[PDB]
Amino acid sequence: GDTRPRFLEQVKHECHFFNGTERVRFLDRYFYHQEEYVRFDSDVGEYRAVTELGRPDAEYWNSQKDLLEQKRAAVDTYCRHNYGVGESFTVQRRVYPEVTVYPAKTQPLQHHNLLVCSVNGFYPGSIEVRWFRNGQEEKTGVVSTGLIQNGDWTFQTLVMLETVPRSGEVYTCQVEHPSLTSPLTVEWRASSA
Amino acid sequence: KEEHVIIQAEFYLNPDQSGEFMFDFDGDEIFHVDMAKKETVWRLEEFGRFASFEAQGALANIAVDKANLEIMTKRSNYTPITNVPPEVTVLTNSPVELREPNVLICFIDKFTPPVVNVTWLRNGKPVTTGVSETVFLPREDHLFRKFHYLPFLPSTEDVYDCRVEHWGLDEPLLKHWEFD
Amino acid sequence: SKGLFRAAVPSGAS
């Protein structure tokens, strides 16, 4: 309803961590709407205009030597410091997946179905989910949602298997995740339900 | 690649005079500062036991951002943001079973500017009881995303929609969900 | 045991 034009300024101060805290990169990034116009990169050591809109700021800010020294110390004073503060509840966080299996539509044997393995509530994102028919891994006919962020520090994923189920078959979904020491596995039997 | 990223994201939006300050770890929110209450709000209550943040510093950062926005608006010959309308998806927090408490999640993605109107509807009527939401989360393409939550008891009788308004949409976008 | 997140501060534009 409200059609007044909008104007947006964003600033993203980023810390990127490689190999624990052994390598850190700090990026101080300024945006006008969606477009980055100036940044400080710890791998460069000074501000650089990203668009011509940023040229005046880069020139102005690089002429202030105590500003620069402070940005140059951000890898330590800011990045490493904040990693330390949050590490116990972020880097160190692990939450178990919950696994459920169910057919997608209810229908007779010898007719095409999707078996769903739903994996829920886990943290961090890295997971692997495998389908077996009896004891052979099925890698054709696997339709997956990929990793879904729930926005509350958990993820889910749904990994579906295309089947034409026959009477005496067992299918198993197998989940591995850094919170688990041995695979979590759930079975589904080709019965009249 | 890189193990982890922490981002402190701020914005200021005119003429709405609305600002945000938040910290992000691998794409989840750690906390934000409420500009109304002027208070640090932890995404999970647990986080508050391990850490603190002086919400006043966020307020001061946003004043600089406001002042910069005035300058950049002028420097661009008053060129405004181009609306990018959201993608909306609705899913459940866990597999759906009758009478088992669950949560519908409205995931609103790839949009700007960071202003939306989001209503949960149950059978075509607005619902507020037990609902929650996040602030605007930053994306690497500099758009935003946002999540809304609705606790519910699944039934055969009910249908739900996530209703989303945004200036880049011609009409409000509804995304539907019902028990399979 | 309980630590304090530090904010980065934005610079003022030319």
Numbering used by the authors:
A (entry chain B): 1 to 193
B (entry chain A): 2 to 181
C (entry chain E): 27 to 40
Authors' text:
The main established association between HLA class II molecules and RA has been correlated to the polymorphic region of the β-chain comprising amino acid residues 70–74 (12) that line the MHC-II pocket close to peptide anchor residue p4 and that is shared between HLA-DRB1*04:01, *04:04, and *01 alleles. In the present study, we focused on citrullinated α-enolase, one of the candidate antigens toward which a large number of RA patients develop autoantibodies. In order to assess the structural bases that underlie stronger T cell responses toward HLA-DRB1*04:01 in complex with the PTM peptide Cit26 compared to the native α-enolase epitope 26 in RA patients, we determined the crystal structures of HLA-DRB1*04:01 in complex peptides 26 and Cit26 at 2.6 and 2.0 Å resolution, respectively.
The most striking responses were established for peptide 26, where only the citrullinated version Cit26 elicited statistically significant T cell responses. In contrast, a small but significant increase in affinity to HLA-DRB1*04:01 was measured for Cit26 compared to 26. Our results reveal that the posttranslational modification does not alter the conformation of the citrullinated peptide Cit26 compared to the native peptide 26. This single significant difference between the two complexes suggests that the citrullinated neo-antigen Cit26 may bypass T cell tolerance and provoke undesired responses from T cells with high and possibly unique specificity to the citrulline residue. Comparative analyses of the crystal structures of HLA-DRB1*04:01/26 and HLA-DRB1*04:01/Cit26 demonstrated that the only structural difference between the two MHC-II/peptide complexes was the modification from arginine to citrulline at peptide position p2. The only difference between the two crystal structures is the side chain of the citrullinated residue p32Cit in Cit26, which similarly to the arginine residue in HLA-DRB1*04:01/26, protrudes toward the solvent readily available for interactions with TCRs. Thus, citrullination of peptide 26 creates a neo-antigen that could select for an entirely different autoreactive T cell repertoire, with most probably high specificity to the citrulline residue in Cit26.
